[PDB]
Ligand binder design. Structure first.
Ligand SMILES: CC(C)(COP(=O)(O)OP(=O)(O)OC[C@H]1O[C@@H](n2cnc3c(N)ncnc32)[C@H](O)[C@@H]1OP(=O)(O)O)[C@@H](O)C(=O)NCCC(=O)NCCS
Ligand SMILES: CC(C)(COP(=O)(O)OP(=O)(O)OC[C@H]1O[C@@H](n2cnc3c(N)ncnc32)[C@H](O)[C@@H]1OP(=O)(O)O)[C@@H](O)C(=O)NCCC(=O)NCCS
Ligand SMILES: CC(C)(COP(=O)(O)OP(=O)(O)OC[C@H]1O[C@@H](n2cnc3c(N)ncnc32)[C@H](O)[C@@H]1OP(=O)(O)O)[C@@H](O)C(=O)NCCC(=O)NCCS
Ligand SMILES: CC(C)(COP(=O)(O)OP(=O)(O)OC[C@H]1O[C@@H](n2cnc3c(N)ncnc32)[C@H](O)[C@@H]1OP(=O)(O)O)[C@@H](O)C(=O)NCCC(=O)NCCS
Lengths: 256, 256, 256, 256
């Protein structure tokens, strides 16, 4: 059998999620707790449950400006069902729009497991001019308030552990070595928290997708119900710079 | 400005969701409550919050068999990032795999607002041989346990209202008119509950997408981490029936 | 066997397309001729071959302004492989960006097969205020030059037939009944030509997709190789109009 | 202006592709020639034109078995428009289903430009156990007939050059060093030909997408017109192996 899975099975037409009867989860687990279960394979603790609710809310939407929203709404504008627009948004979560969560989780997890000093790890990255994933922001040069909020919650709950500490120690050390502070950004913060929960770095973008899809749904629904179809189109004379060949004739012999 | 929105804005680089500071929502609202807010535009009541958690959990996954899971995992098998596989799954939520939520919400809402008798509404549909959306199941002929669970919760919470009543009254009336019971299925149940919350029928598939994306993430992650790339391919001799032209030669003059 | 097909089969690991050995088609049929074969199931005539080359070239690209190009390039900007950006473009070919080909083919084919007068058909549509598919243009009020080019070729080749005639007769009749000319647009022209070839109206968008994908590839490649990742993002203060709730505080009791 | 392009522009509402009036290309260039133009930026020679027709035909379809066809048809089965199914197919062209064209073009181009001996290049790859892109096949151990057909055409046309020679010299050298022949497969053959044309290796998947989309259209159209919606679903008891947790009860305190 080529179709193998350990996620879900049906016993007597009833759905079981990671071994639990779905009908027993309905009304008893929150959606974030059920998400933790389906992804991890086991029920979350109370502290994990609260952190998962906070991580997912943290990324629920970022407005109309990101390429995901532009893509989702442009596909909707072409005259498509809501699922099709949302899917187009999800496609935009590439290396520059979600991949940093995977990269930062790998860096934080490998950093903690290496048992090498934060000084040595940061020196090695800064020396080879390789970007440290999950650090830096165009505007925030003191701290990323989204990271601070998540870390404050992690500390109040006594969830904050070795991965959170490592991620913050690295920001402080980058500042020390560069003489210029580089913040632990929200991608690095979510990566630290998901790592603290024991999730594989290869699942990093999953948290972002699950959290942001409600925002995409809102954007696509708004485009479909408040805008005329085909309204998302550029005005070539106003919005576009042409950089190509000026007009030219085909060779005469090719004209029929 | 062609890019208009009432969903989110940034004030001093901080994100505001439907007017609320996102950093104040983080740690204070559950993910399902934040979903209600972003979609509806206002905070949910306590009863709405509980029903939204239950609806979303109800659809979190349905195993590897649906075309969404097949598509998501086949795209992942082609050697793609997790977002790309999940998006392919979302594309599969078409008229036969999610559209019934839109249709059932329109039927339930129009049914309630018409103030026509349930007998008359059902007689008109059965007479014109048009399928009644949100009713019937291949296996469940007494009741859909997923609907029963959701409706039991709605009744315990005193959330059950005119839309839930209408949806159940229609199932009973179909049974009365056909002499054969046709259940209110889980699509009809979610449609009734979302209608009870005052959501537009055009948002119906949104609830399904938001709820099921965690399952798609789990399936795509499992395919990427437990299976060899390109393992999702058919065996033509074993799995395929060819119904086309038998082999034939091109005309000789076309062979160079 | 649930996987049935009459398109392609393998005999001794060799691919056969609609019964012809693919290796015999390579070097002997043009790409447009092979497209006709795979879609229709039989080889094209010389006139069909020339018309298919012309239809496909007619739609090869329309610049960066359409929502398909915007979506494709925005997905590429998110940091994605070329296939992922192209696919996002294809998603945008909805009811307002390709669906008119399906609609116009159905209208032209049903119009020709009804044997009702063009006067009566147009009167019935204009009376019920239903848009006639494949007619009208924002700028072209005399003739669509893209339609004229295709129809001139169809006439020179003696391909122009009952479907082409019907489509042009309808434009003339709309003008006669409205006292204002409404052109047969390029969607209607391609629909007429594909109908003249005997293709099903349900394949209409297929011609557009096949023809335009080279343009999408060009756009995505250009975005990936000439622009910095994440460059396709709006500037909220400059490009966006916010129409939602002004900022508001959460209820105090919800703040922890 | 953030939307820059050198591909297409409009002058007086008329489309210009790489500086040529689109209406002059229609009826005068074949579709494969127009594809070459839009991708390369200049008109093809007669030999390039013939090779482009042959490359594109070579990949037009591969039947229902690949994950692209499975994904496209499964999305169509969910009840979606033809563009949506085709797009899902295109998403499946990942690292294991199209990426080898990019890799093989880079290898062939870098191999030719290095001016290092084929012996040295192959020894370095075989020593580090890195797969050589564009070589090997599960069944063909003497030669890939699809490569032979393309190379025979390239030789008859006097198109065969330094890139084609390098690609074939590498297959012969792998055989010499391993004592077991590894064929130049069709991905390597197309990569060699596209490299001979001077295309960038980053465009490799583009040729595959453009060539295969007609096959995807055929598959999606066939699924939509010959199969019942939702027919593409697995039978869990027959097709799936469950490898997860056996059923288990939730903790009693969580049951309300
Ligand atoms: C957001 C971003 C573009 C802003 O960078 P910026 O405006 O150049 O940063 P600053 O002005 O504060 O300057 C920081 C300095 O450290 C460098 N730097 C920036 N981010 C860095 C990082 N994450 N790791 C190491 N060095 C970094 C900059 O080049 C600059 O160097 P300088 O000494 O030559 O001046 C950038 O930091 C970034 O890409 N962050 C995310 C990193 C990431 O996650 N990437 C990998 C996954 S995609
Ligand atoms: C799941 C489904 C395929 C199973 O149908 P089934 O196995 O034929 O149903 P049953 O064997 O219990 O028989 C029910 C009878 O009512 C009909 N019927 C089934 N679902 C019906 C519905 N929702 N409304 C009205 N009539 C329906 C059947 O044709 C059958 O008629 P009969 O008197 O000729 O025997 C079907 O009920 C269905 O499609 N349900 C969803 C409906 C929906 O939401 N569609 C619209 C949005 S896609
Ligand atoms: C491109 C388009 C938006 C431009 O329309 P426009 O600028 O309003 O057209 P005009 O100014 O030339 O006026 C044409 C008149 O006929 C109407 N009209 C426009 N297109 C029409 C059509 N295809 N069929 C019937 N009536 C049409 C207009 O409403 C207007 O009516 P009026 O008597 O009240 O003034 C429009 O014609 C269109 O949508 N064309 C494509 C139609 C199509 O294929 N739709 C169905 C598939 S999506
Ligand atoms: C199709 C494929 C799976 C079949 O491989 P196979 O059945 O193992 O091959 P064979 O049985 O003929 O044996 C060839 C030998 O060379 C190795 N080999 C296979 N393909 C190779 C390649 N392209 N380069 C180098 N070594 C290769 C095999 O491991 C085997 O080694 P052995 O000495 O230990 O027996 C494989 O060759 C392949 O993946 N080809 C495509 C390569 C490619 O393009 N990859 C990079 C982009 S994804």
């Amino acid at each position: 059998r080529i179709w193998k899975t350990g996620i879900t099975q049906h016993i007597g037409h009833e759905t079981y999620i990671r071994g639990y009867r779905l009908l027993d989860l309905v009304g008893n687990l929150s959606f974030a707790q059920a998400i933790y279960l389906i992804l991890k394979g086991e029920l979350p603790t109370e502290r994990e449950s609260r952190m998962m609710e906070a991580m997912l809310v943290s990324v629920i939407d970022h407005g109309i400006a990101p390429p995901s929203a532009i893509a989702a709404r442009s596909v909707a504008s072409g005259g498509n069902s809501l699922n099709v627009g949302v899917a187009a948004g999800v496609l935009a979560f590439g290396s520059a729009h979600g991949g940093a969560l995977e990269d930062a989780m790998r860096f934080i997890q490998e950093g903690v497991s290496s048992k090498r000093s934060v000084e040595d790890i940061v020196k090695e990255y800064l020396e080879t001019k390789k970007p440290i994933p999950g650090y830096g922001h165009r505007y925030y040069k003191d701290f990323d308030p989204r990271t601070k909020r998540l870390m404050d919650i992690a500390r109040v709950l006594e969830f904050y552990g070795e991965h959170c500490k490592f991620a913050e120690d690295v920001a402080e050390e980058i500042g020390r070595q560069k003489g210029k502070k580089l913040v632990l950004n929200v991608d690095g913060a979510i990566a630290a928290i998901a790592s603290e929960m024991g999730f594989d770095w290869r699942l990093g973008k999953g948290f972002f997708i699950i959290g942001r899809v409600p925002g995409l749904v809102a954007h696509v629904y708004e485009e479909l119900t408040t805008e005329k179809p085909f309204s998302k189109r550029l005005d070539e004379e106003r919005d576009v710079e042409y950089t190509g060949s000026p007009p030219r004739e085909l060779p005469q012999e090719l004209k029929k």
